[PDB]
Enzyme design. Structure first.
Site, short mmCIF file in Angstrom:
data_model
loop_
_atom_site.label_atom_id
_atom_site.label_comp_id
_atom_site.label_asym_id
_atom_site.label_seq_id
_atom_site.Cartn_x
_atom_site.Cartn_y
_atom_site.Cartn_z
CG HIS A 1 -6.08 -3.53 17.60
ND1 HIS A 1 -5.61 -2.33 18.07
CD2 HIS A 1 -5.95 -4.41 18.62
CE1 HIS A 1 -5.20 -2.47 19.32
NE2 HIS A 1 -5.40 -3.73 19.68
CG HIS B 1 -1.58 1.29 1.54
ND1 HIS B 1 -2.39 1.96 0.65
CD2 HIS B 1 -1.60 2.02 2.68
CE1 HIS B 1 -2.83 3.08 1.21
NE2 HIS B 1 -2.38 3.12 2.45
CG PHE C 1 -11.15 -1.97 15.02
CD1 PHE C 1 -12.55 -1.89 15.06
CD2 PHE C 1 -10.41 -1.15 15.86
CE1 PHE C 1 -13.19 -1.00 15.93
CE2 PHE C 1 -11.03 -0.26 16.72
CZ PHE C 1 -12.43 -0.18 16.76
CG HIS D 1 -0.39 5.54 4.46
ND1 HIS D 1 -1.02 4.79 5.42
CD2 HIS D 1 -0.77 6.83 4.67
CE1 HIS D 1 -1.73 5.59 6.20
NE2 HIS D 1 -1.60 6.83 5.76
CG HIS E 1 -5.18 5.05 6.48
ND1 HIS E 1 -5.11 6.28 5.85
CD2 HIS E 1 -4.64 4.15 5.60
CE1 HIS E 1 -4.58 6.13 4.65
NE2 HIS E 1 -4.29 4.85 4.47
CG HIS F 1 -2.92 -2.70 3.40
ND1 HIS F 1 -3.97 -3.40 3.97
CD2 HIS F 1 -3.09 -1.41 3.77
CE1 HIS F 1 -4.74 -2.56 4.64
NE2 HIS F 1 -4.23 -1.35 4.53
CG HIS G 1 -6.77 2.85 2.22
ND1 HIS G 1 -5.71 2.16 1.68
CD2 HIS G 1 -6.80 2.54 3.54
CE1 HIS G 1 -5.12 1.46 2.63
NE2 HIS G 1 -5.75 1.67 3.76
CG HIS H 1 -7.82 -0.23 8.02
ND1 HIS H 1 -6.69 -0.85 8.51
CD2 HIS H 1 -7.42 0.52 6.97
CE1 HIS H 1 -5.65 -0.50 7.78
NE2 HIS H 1 -6.06 0.33 6.84
CB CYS H 2 -7.95 0.02 13.67
SG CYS H 2 -7.00 0.54 15.09
CG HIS H 3 -2.57 2.37 9.78
ND1 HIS H 3 -1.43 1.60 9.67
CD2 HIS H 3 -2.83 2.83 8.53
CE1 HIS H 3 -1.01 1.61 8.42
NE2 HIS H 3 -1.84 2.35 7.70
CB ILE H 4 -3.27 -0.74 16.13
CG1 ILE H 4 -3.06 0.62 16.80
CG2 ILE H 4 -2.49 -1.83 16.88
CD1 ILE H 4 -3.83 0.79 18.12
CG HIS I 1 -8.71 1.70 18.68
ND1 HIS I 1 -7.86 0.62 18.76
CD2 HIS I 1 -9.61 1.54 19.68
CE1 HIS I 1 -8.23 -0.16 19.76
NE2 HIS I 1 -9.29 0.37 20.34
CG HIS J 1 2.29 -0.21 5.18
ND1 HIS J 1 1.21 -0.99 5.54
CD2 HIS J 1 1.80 1.04 5.01
CE1 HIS J 1 0.12 -0.25 5.59
NE2 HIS J 1 0.45 0.99 5.28
#
Ligand SMILES: *[C@@H]1O[C@H](CO)[C@@H](O[C@@H]2O[C@H](CO)[C@@H](O)[C@H](O)[C@H]2NC(C)=O)[C@H](O)[C@H]1NC(C)=O
Ligand SMILES: *[C@@H]1O[C@H](CO)[C@@H](O[C@@H]2O[C@H](CO)[C@@H](O)[C@H](O)[C@H]2NC(C)=O)[C@H](O)[C@H]1NC(C)=O
Ligand SMILES: OC[C@H]1O[C@@H](O)[C@@H](O)[C@@H](O)[C@@H]1O
Ligand SMILES: [Cu+2]
Ligand SMILES: [Cu+2]
Ligand SMILES: [Cu+2]
Length: 495
Positions: free
Chosen positions: A454, A64, A459, A66, A396, A111, A398, A448-451, A393, A109
């Site tokens: 999770h 991805h 998430f 980002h 992000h 994805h 896209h 979605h959550c970028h942790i 949390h 990174h």
């Protein structure tokens, strides 16, 4: 240093960024992954050659890019089973996109699942030859990129499902509790010069409270958006956020601690943990500087865009075409949003659309897809809750930048000149972080959550934006169309 046209070869090998040796993911044969650069408006052609042989960390991959809007090239966005099927090992795939109207700090990174924590993550800078802030600094180059990352001695699929980091890495180097002699990162400056430092969080989990002893930071870019300069003495940076800041190297020639306090794990600096070195002629030794209390911390609500751009829509709650509320929960080891947990469908969401899906009820997974009208203003609220552990949390969106009408730790709404960004903390229970954006970009987009630990737990939701125009707006290259057949032919152990 490489790019905007380049090969990226993915492989496995041993790394020891904190003096501990472990198997990880390499990119062009190095850890941490190399910096890619280009200029505003450029065509990027990044040939991801997948040569990974380790299934525990996954031999398949997906990148991805980002922060990039990917208008017309939704197929190139990166999310596995939203925008593509993963690149299978022994194969290559070309991401061919353009960056009109965007400049600033980005990153790339994996994805696919939690693969990026295993090392496939690197910074990207898109230089603006007419940067509105060009005159604030003398140096902006490869040595002025600063990356922060969490690092684990046990791999993503090997350790705990929510692991504690053994180390914070700054420019891919840091110390752990048991490697206190490990090499620290050194960021060199000359007295009298002014630096555009580009700070990017490659974190899989923690947020860092970032400061530099004795120095102030003039923040001028957030998540690839130009700001009005805003001087602070510390900042909290969340997973996947970027900030450009100007540092005036105007203090006594000396070594100064660069600090990055994680919100979990080792929360101190004992023995040079969570730290790098700002070195001015100064001795090649560790800083012995003291952290002074933060009296002027970054406050997200006090940031604004350079232009003072108003939020989309009319200045009132629900004053938009579509307002949505995302209610977080947790059941059975799974995160939920509006009662639904995200499980990657077998047919990528984009492919479902191209294949004739017409609505969100047609789209898999059921309950995880939201249809968005074409050319509209949208408002999303993401109220924080204890019912979804490990807050705050960061979310992000896209294919989009958004107005942060409301920030974490703020009670107020700002429709007139709010900050615009692409990753926002949803805060602690009681917050109601609220965002608005324009549907200017047909295609399926992950929210979605970028942790990442999770994101494994579902998430996530998918914004199915302007369904009727997705196919026409996003012609896909035959290599894209070959990803799924090739990936579905693989046996699970080769995935
Ligand atoms: C593939 O990668 C995995 C995950 O990183 C490696 O896992 C290691 O497994 C060994 C032996 O069971 C453990 O002692 C290590 O602690 C694991 N490392 C990590 C980082 O968790 C595995 O070694 C790799 N396979 C090969 C052939 O190198
Ligand atoms: C967070 O903000 C949202 C949006 O303002 C709130 O949702 C609205 O709630 C009011 C009153 O219950 C209703 O009039 C609307 O139908 C809601 N808007 C929607 C669903 O789009 C939400 O209640 C707030 N949550 C918290 C905890 O404050
Ligand atoms: O899977 C982790 C394993 O790694 C081995 O190298 C040893 O350190 C073991 O103590 C441990 O069980
Ligand atoms: Cu990302
Ligand atoms: Cu989270
Ligand atoms: Cu994402």
């Amino acid at each position: 240093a490489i790019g905007p046209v380049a090969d990226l070869t993915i492989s496995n090998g041993a790394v020891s960024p904190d003096g501990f040796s472990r198997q990880a993911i390499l990119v062009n044969d190095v850890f941490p992954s190399p910096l890619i650069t280009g200029n505003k408006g450029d065509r990027f052609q990044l040939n991801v050659i997948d040569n990974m042989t380790n299934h525990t960390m996954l031999k398949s991959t997906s990148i991805h890019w980002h922060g990039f809007f990917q208008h017309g090239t939704n197929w190139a966005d990166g999310p596995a089973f939203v925008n593509q099927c993963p690149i299978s090992t022994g194969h290559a795939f070309l991401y061919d996109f353009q960056v009109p109207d965007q400049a600033g700090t980005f990153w790339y990174h994996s994805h696919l699942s939690t693969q990026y924590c295993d090392g496939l993550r690197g910074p990207i800078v898109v230089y603006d030859p007419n940067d509105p802030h060009a005159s604030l600094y003398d140096v902006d180059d490869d040595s002025t990129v600063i990356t922060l990352a969490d690092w684990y001695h046990l791999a993503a699929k090997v350790g705990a499902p929510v692991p504690t980091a053994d180390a914070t890495l700054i420019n891919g180097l840091g110390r752990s509790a048991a490697t206190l002699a490990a090499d620290l990162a050194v960021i060199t400056v000359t007295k009298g010069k002014r630096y555009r430092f580009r700070l990017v969080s490659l974190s899989c989990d923690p947020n860092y409270t970032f400061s530099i002893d004795g120095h102030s930071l003039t923040v001028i870019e957030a998540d690839s958006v130009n700001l009005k300069p805003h001087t602070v003495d510390s900042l909290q940076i969340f997973a996947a956020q970027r900030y450009s800041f100007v540092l005036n190297a105007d203090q006594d020639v000396d070594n100064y601690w660069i600090r990055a306090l994680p919100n979990s794990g080792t929360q101190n600096f004992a023995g040079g943990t969570n730290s790098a070195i700002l070195r001015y002629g100064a001795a090649p030794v560790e800083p012995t500087t003291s952290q002074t209390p933060s009296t002027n911390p970054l406050v997200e609500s006090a940031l604004t865009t350079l232009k003072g751009t108003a939020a989309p829509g009319s200045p009132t709650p629900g004053g938009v075409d579509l307002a949505l509320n995302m209610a977080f929960g947790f059941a059975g080891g799974n995160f939920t949003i509006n009662g639904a947990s995200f499980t990657p469908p077998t047919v990528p969401v984009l492919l479902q659309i191209l294949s004739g899906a017409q609505s969100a009820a047609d789209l898999l997974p059921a309950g995880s897809v939201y249809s968005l009208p074409a050319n509209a203003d949208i408002e999303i609220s993401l109220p924080a809750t204890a019912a979804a552990p490990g807050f705050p949390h960061p979310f992000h969106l896209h294919g989009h930048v958004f107005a942060v009408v409301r920030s974490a730790g703020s009670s107020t709404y700002n429709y007139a000149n709010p900050v615009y960004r692409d990753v926002v903390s949803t805060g602690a229970p009681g917050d109601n972080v609220t965002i608005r954006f324009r549907t200017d970009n047909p295609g399926p987009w992950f929210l979605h959550c970028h942790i990442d630990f999770h994101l494994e737990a579902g998430f996530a939701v998918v914004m199915a934006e302007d369904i009727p125009d997705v196919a026409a707006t996003n012609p896909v290259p035959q290599a894209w169309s070959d990803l799924c057949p090739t990936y579905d032919a693989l046996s699970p152990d080769d995935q």
